[PDB]
Amino acid sequence: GEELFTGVVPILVELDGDVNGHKFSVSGEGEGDATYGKLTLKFICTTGKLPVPWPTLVTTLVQCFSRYPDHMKQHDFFKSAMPEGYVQERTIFFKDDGNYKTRAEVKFEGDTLVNRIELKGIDFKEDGNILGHKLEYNYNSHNVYIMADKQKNGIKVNFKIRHNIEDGSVQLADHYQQNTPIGDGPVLLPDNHYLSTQSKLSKDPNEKRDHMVLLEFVRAAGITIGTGFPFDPHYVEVLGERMHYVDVGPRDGTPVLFLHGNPTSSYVWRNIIPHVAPTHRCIAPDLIGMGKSDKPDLGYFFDDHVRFMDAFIEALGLEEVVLVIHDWGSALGFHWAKRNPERVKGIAFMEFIRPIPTWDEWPRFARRTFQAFRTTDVGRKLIIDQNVFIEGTLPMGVVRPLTEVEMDHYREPFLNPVDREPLWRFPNELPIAGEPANIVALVEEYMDWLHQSPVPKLLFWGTPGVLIPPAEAARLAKSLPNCKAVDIGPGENLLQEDNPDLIGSEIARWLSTLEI
Ligand SMILES: [Cl-]
C-alpha cells in the first residue's frame, strides 16, 4: 500500500471529455513524490485546442501523492487502496453555469500510477466564464475535506474551488467527490481530516500544442495559529549596522532573550511572546543580514553572527538574561552563555545545534538535500539562485501546512537573491560528520559547558524532529543538570509552528520557578 510511495513514482494521465457537444482528449505524464506531497506534470490536448479553460480540469486531472504526516498515516485511504486502486467520481457545480460529471480509475499499471478519466459537461452557457474562456491562467489554494463512507467501504470528499475570473470576480465550482476501492482487500477508512493544496500553472516555451504544466503540493492535516506580527519595530545600531528587534513586557526584572535560526526571524516567536510578556520582558532580535535587520555584504559565518549578537546584547545594556533559543540561535545562546555564565538564569531550547557525528543521524529524506546544500556549486544554485531553503526546506520543517500569509512573512527578507547569502552559509556551518572542524570544536565546547552547569534548562522536542531525534532528546534531558523536558507532539524543526501554545505556556510556568 504505502510501500509503493517511498520514492518518485511516474504518472500517466489520459482523459476523454464532452462539454456542450465539444469532444476532446488530454494526455499527461510526469512524476510524483509523496514525501513532499509533490506533483510535476505536463498535460497536452491531443485533439486540438481545449474547448474549456485549463484551470477547470485541474481537479479532474491522484490524491495518493498527498503527504500524510506520520501521526495520521492511518487515515491515508488513497495509498492503502493501491496497487488495485480506487474509483473516483465527482460532480462539479460551477456557480450559475454548467456542471462536470467525472468517473475515473486511479490504479497501478506496470510501474506507473495511471489516472484514466471520463468527463461529461452539460448546461453550460455559451457566453459564460467556462465556454467564454474568461478564466485567468492561475490557481488558488484550497482545503479538501475528507470523511469516511463505511457503507461503500469508501470516502466522501467535499470542497469548493475558487477560479479567478479576468474581470476580478471569482467563479465557484462546488465539488462532490466519492472514492471506493477496486480490490476487495481491506483499506483505511479515515477520521475527519482535510488536505491543504497549492498549485502553480505554467507553460513550456518549446511546446507547440495546447498544453498545461502543473506543480502541486498537498499536505494532510486536521487531526491532532495566528499569522499576525503586531509588534512595534525597534532598531539599535550595532557595529555600524542597524538591527531590528521586538521589545515588550515590563521594563524591570530579568529580560528573556529569544534567538531564531535559519531561515526564520523574530516572526517565529510571534505566538510564544504573548505567553511571556505579561510577566517578563521579551527581546527578540532579527539576526544580522536577516529579518528586518540590515543586510551588509558579509561572509555570514557563525562567527559573524557571534560578533553582532555580542554587540547587540551590550547595546541594550542587558545584565542577567533568560534564553529561549532555536536552531542557530541556540548555538549563539550556548556559546555566549559559556563565555558569560554568571549572566544566564535559565535556558529554554528546542531543536538546537549539536555535534552530529554521522549523516545516518540526519533525517534520511533530507540527507541528499542538505549534502547538496553544502556545496559551492549546486548548493549556491539551490539556495541563492532558486531560494529552495525558503520555498521548500522551510515548509518541510513544519508538520502543518504553512499558509501563504506566513510564507510571505518568511519570504520578505530574501526577495532579492543577493540577500540570501546567510541562507546558504548556515547549512554549510552545520557540524555534521566532523565538518566544519571549527564549528564542531566550538559546539563541543558549549555542550561540555552545558553538562557541567547548574543553570535551569528546559528542552522542547517533537517527533520525529530533525536536529534532535526523540531518543537524543531523552538522553540529554537525563544527563544535563536541572533539565526539564517537554514533548510537544509531532514536529520537525520549527516546533513553534506546530504547538506554540504549549511552548509559550510551559515557558511562562517554568519562568516562575527561577530566581530572577
Ligand atoms: Cl541551517
Author numbering: 3 to 63, 67 to 229, 238 to 529
Which text from the study accompanies this structure?
We hypothesized that the ChemoG1 conformation observed in the crystal structure exists only transiently in solution and identified interface mutations to stabilize it (that is, eGFP: A206K and T225R; HT7: E143R, E147R and L271E). SiR-labeled ChemoG5 (that is, ChemoG5SiR) carries all interface mutations and exhibits a near-quantitative FRET efficiency (95.8 ± 0.1%). The fluorescence intensity of eGFP was not affected by the surface mutations. Despite the ionic nature of some of the interactions, the FRET was minimally affected by changes in pH or salt concentration. In U-2 OS cells, the stepwise improvement in FRET of SiR-labeled ChemoG1 to ChemoG5 was confirmed by fluorescence microscopy with a maximum FRET/eGFP ratio of 16.4 ± 2.7 for ChemoG5 that, in turn, was not noticeably affected by changes in the local environment after expression in different subcellular locations. Labeling ChemoG5 with different rhodamine fluorophores yielded efficient FRET pairs with acceptor maximum fluorescence emission wavelengths ranging from 556 nm (Janelia Fluor525 (JF525)) to 686 nm (JF669; FRET efficiencies of ≥94%). Transposing the structural features of ChemoG5 to the ChemoX constructs led to optimized ChemoB, ChemoC and ChemoY variants all exhibiting near-quantitative FRET efficiencies (≥94%) after SiR labeling.
